[model samples]
Target: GSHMKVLLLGFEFLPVKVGGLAEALTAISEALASLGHEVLVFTPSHGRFQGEEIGKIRVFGEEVQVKVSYEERGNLRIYRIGGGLLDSEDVYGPGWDGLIRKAVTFGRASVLLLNDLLREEPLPDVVHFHDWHTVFAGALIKKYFKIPAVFTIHRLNKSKLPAFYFHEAGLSELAPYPDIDPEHTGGYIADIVTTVSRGYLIDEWGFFRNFEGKITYVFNGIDCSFWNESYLTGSRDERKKSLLSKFGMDEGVTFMFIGRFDRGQKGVDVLLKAIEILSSKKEFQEMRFIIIGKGDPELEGWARSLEEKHGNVKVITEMLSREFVRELYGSVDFVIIPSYFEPFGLVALEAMCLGAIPIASAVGGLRDIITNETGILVKAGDPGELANAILKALELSRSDLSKFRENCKKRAMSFSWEKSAERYVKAYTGSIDRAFDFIL
Candidate 1:
């Protein structure tokens, strides 16, 4: 039995946020535990909750008045580390300088904890860091200890830089912070870099040429047993009726879009335009578009403007509970994921798992996850093409759509967190055979 003891460092973890990265890590941690591995997760303290104990994983928070919380669920142990004032309402605290001070101080302290843990017990075979936020930990751990580092980039900074750069330079620092460029940034410090899907890993490198070869593709996995049709199929019709009523749409063919609703990245603008096109068609006179998830205030206002101008657009701007989101997925007639550059479109997978036919832009991981037999893929960012794809999906017969549903779930099931963890174990060991990139 390979009972490898692993420590995961991430910016976000399960029950922290609902979406791709957190889900990916939590599910993977759970799967690894199921496989007889000892796993522990460390994440920043957020909101009212400092820490929680769930399964065999331990979650800990680290802040000014840091306190640790633990929970055991099934085979996992979670350790949470958080302390006073550091868990302030604002992420950066009161001012620009304040935020930097907090980040640096917290980063240093987190590294110290890692070093202490290594000294006390047999060190982790590998320290897995998720996203650029935790990349600093990788550099810090390597500098202080002789442990291996594995980095996963959920999304390329290229897609998020303009806004991030503005915030990092204009408010936090007088100049642009380091590592804005994924190629030249802290990512290069990791021993082995991995991304969600092969397509994304390649596309990201092409966009950031210097990042090539340093990155590997590790497709994310879903817990398909939870999403099986047996658990989902019975509730679709009733859920659809209740949701449609809640939105006051008595007569319209409804289509759902879920994500952060960002303008350039998630492609909400494209979806809005496609909805405008759909509204004009005679066959779609009864069509309505439902946009879900949260994002920038300006972007949300823009979506509101669409609702004001178009009679059939509804934006659920309020955050949805995870259970409600699952119901929404099972009920929607069609789900659209129009990300301009999604690392891996987990929403599309969720929609498919819930039996909704997905019509997504063919870019990043969406291109790899969706196929003609499973869902429709249009060229990324083309509203007219998206409208056509939506129409084609509407044309699918119930039986044909059921086949798509079956194939979609089957595809999602093939990728499991346990399998992902196994691949990770191999990758981690491989890194040991090479010279270290960062030293601790």
Candidate 2:
């Protein structure tokens, strides 16, 4: 049959919001459903969330009473498991031990839910899961079920987990090896281990190599419907002026940075350092800079100090609505993503969607999307190189910038969740065929 039943698992989904995980999971599931497939997406409720309570399912392996209540989202049939460990506003709020228990409980509940469903309904053809957070459930679903398992690594944290957690989730056959990374376990046990981007799969080969022949990649797609250039209210010049007025600033060349202040990876530190190095420059003074998002108070403190030190710079720690962010993207000349590593940067796609060129770090997934025609790439972690790129962007003529923006729009259009889902469907069907052949 062309239409296959698929079970999708993730730690985050729409309304329970965490990070990119929620948006990715939600969009992809919709995309798969659009392709005439029966898709069931699952996630933890993260407290009293919005959804109709379908029913409650008991976890099979655990002795302690843990009844995970389920919720539905209609056409998607999103099953949100709610209980003690699973229901919390904090996705990782419970600390390390709580996170472990949360994952294990979710794992136990997932397989049992499948068992219950299969008693009356048909088994899903494939079970697809995302990230390290959902690995416990994904790994359990992989081992216990005859269905194919497709594990998509959104970002490889190489997060260490105790082998005991695996045993706790009925994954003893693959664990109890002491300190272990969940990505390794998920990657090894799944029928196919997929990275978010081809560049990440290659760049992180030291970690990905263990999976070897089973490793592949599928690029994440952008929702251009919301992030589109059509959302702009006025001419670029008019919009830029409104954005400038909103930040209470006078502008020359406009540039922006929107992400967390994590120095280790997001490289907001690198962006800050680059700004500091160029703080005294005549060109830098003319540039109106807006840095958004929150994380790492030390970095926020530094960013705050810069806002005082530089009249042209504004550092906002509050979360921005997507409409407002769209305004900034439509107005800004350039957006800096100074991440040390990016796993298929949605920022690049989001920025490009609104006709803003991106100056991203030359690392991981950034390489796959950014090109000379669309955006610039700077050496990751090198503040001076980033600073130079920023300066260079300032000097580019509006004529050339417009040309690049057109290219950016076309490039972003080429990627969509529907396309990515088609690729995943191939992986699902291909893996199941080969697996059945080997078994025969």
Candidate 3:
């Protein structure tokens, strides 16, 4: 069994994305397939209707029939389970009203898919699931199907749901809880647990202390192809001039921020504060900023208020055209990622790949890579420190910036899907009995 029938379980995949989860899954799955392994991906359809209709599986608690669909990508096969709220294109679906039910159903449908595949195919060698989104399905695959499960943690969600959801996911006895923590339960049930980076795997051990020996890490690689500098249509100056004119701002040393305006981790709030701190300085007059993305009404309001007062700042409040964002990456002198606790930020890598230095929060994955050579790393959640770094970079001559840009691209070359895929393949065959946590 040198080559695996690698089954990937997640709530998101290619053609449906809420975050980088889909990208990570697609690249890893595709890369695994390219290496002569037959990769099978199972995910929710997100109401996308493209693949051939397969069969139906009724979820346990709701007893509603969810139709499954199948699509093949060379050596990779993706099975999407959809029906009822599962048909809702809203990824996690308008927050927690029936979200747990949706997650549970993915689990239910996953088992059904495995049973169906068994009629023709030998059982897949391993089940690799991502985040808490696939926890219920991952646990079921481990306990009932007796498959070796490698649970991959991207960001830890210490979520507690009503025991009813756990019961509905068919783990009523195994997880006997008044209120259950699915993240804990998922890691506990997994045969071998994994995380996205070596730093995150070590730094968050307090949260992950329960599964010590079983836990390991393989850094998630950024796909540098689409974000490559070769894709830029014009010189950096020409791109910046066009962007500044489009946003109705007189150009200066361009800086940009793009990400969800969320309460958790993503520190758009801190970025706003850093802007406020920088605005008072004389050098601020020459600086122009383009803020893209929208979420959390309060955070959006802060961005808008700044945009209204400052001609130098423009907030798009917008997936935004990937073409446009890639151009912005090429145009900007620095790309801002002020995440409070980033677990290997894809932004820093993407920015660096295009020769835009990252001004990132020095926590988790940021500190591990964003050294002096590639970008500036500052204290997480501290606006004062962030502002100071921005000011320091502003004074650096374009010659210094050019030297750093060269370093950025070179450092970026150190990461890729090919390298990460090799590491994951090694993990797929690791001893399933490495350690014993709570059984599902």
Report the number of the highest-lDDT candidate: 3
Model 2 superposed RMSD (Cα): 3.9
* lDDT digits (tens) for residues 1-440 of candidate 1: 36677778765677775445767788878887788878777766645455432212111232244445666676666655554433554643447544444444445546656555566777777777776556545556655566777777777654223335324222223125532443344456666777778677556655433434455667787776666556544555677777788887764456899878666888988887887777778767556688987777877877898888876678887777766777777777788988898788778877778787788888889888888888888899899999888777666642445677778778777767777777777766653222122411
lDDT of each: 0.67, 0.81, 0.82
Candidate ranking under TM-score, highest first, comes to 2, 3, 1
Candidate 2: worst-modelled 10 consecutive residues by lDDT: 431-440
State the local distance difference test value for candidate 3.
0.82
lDDT of 1 at 219: 76
- Sort by lDDT, top down from the best: 3, 2, 1
Name model 1 segments beyond 4 Å from true: 18-20, 46-67, 70-77, 83-86, 89-100, 158-185, 207-212, 228-253, 286-288, 293-315, 431-440
Instruction: List model 3 lDDT by residue over 83-164, tens digit each.
Output: 6667777798647956777888778777877888899989889899998878888888887889888888998877788888
TM-scores, all models, native as reference: 0.79, 0.91, 0.90
Better of 2 and 3 by lDDT: 3
Reference-based TM-score, model 3: 0.90
Q: Evaluated with TM-score, which candidate comes out highest?
A: 2
Compared with the true structure, the alpha-carbon lDDT of candidate 1 equals: 0.67
Model 1 clash number = 36
Candidate 2 lDDT, tens digit per residue, 37-128? 88897788777554443345443353433344455544467777766577767797498888888887778767766776787988888899
